[PDB]
A = this chain, B = another copy of it.
Amino acid sequence: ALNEGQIVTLAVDEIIETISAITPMAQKAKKYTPPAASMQRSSNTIWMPVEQE
């Protein structure tokens, strides 16, 4: 028989992909970026009017 040094190999190239998550709600909801310079002086707040009745 052949008795020799043993090694432990790891295959960094082959990764066992396990998880795949979808994010539809964050894609449907709209994104807005108010001007940062005005946001800083306000408390990071914008006020929007509501439709009048």
Contacts and interface: CB of A to CB of B under 8 A. Distances in A.
Interface of A: 4-12, 14-19, 32, 34, 38-39, 41-43, 45-51, 53
Contact of A42 (B6, B39, B46): B6
A3 B15 CA distance: 50
A51 B15 contact: yes
How many copies of the polypeptide does the oligomer hold? 2
Contact of A50 (B18, B41, B46): B18
Q: Is the interface of A mostly helix, strand, loop or mixed?
A: loop
Contact of A41 (B6, B34, B41): B6
B47 A16 contact: no
A9 B46 contact: yes
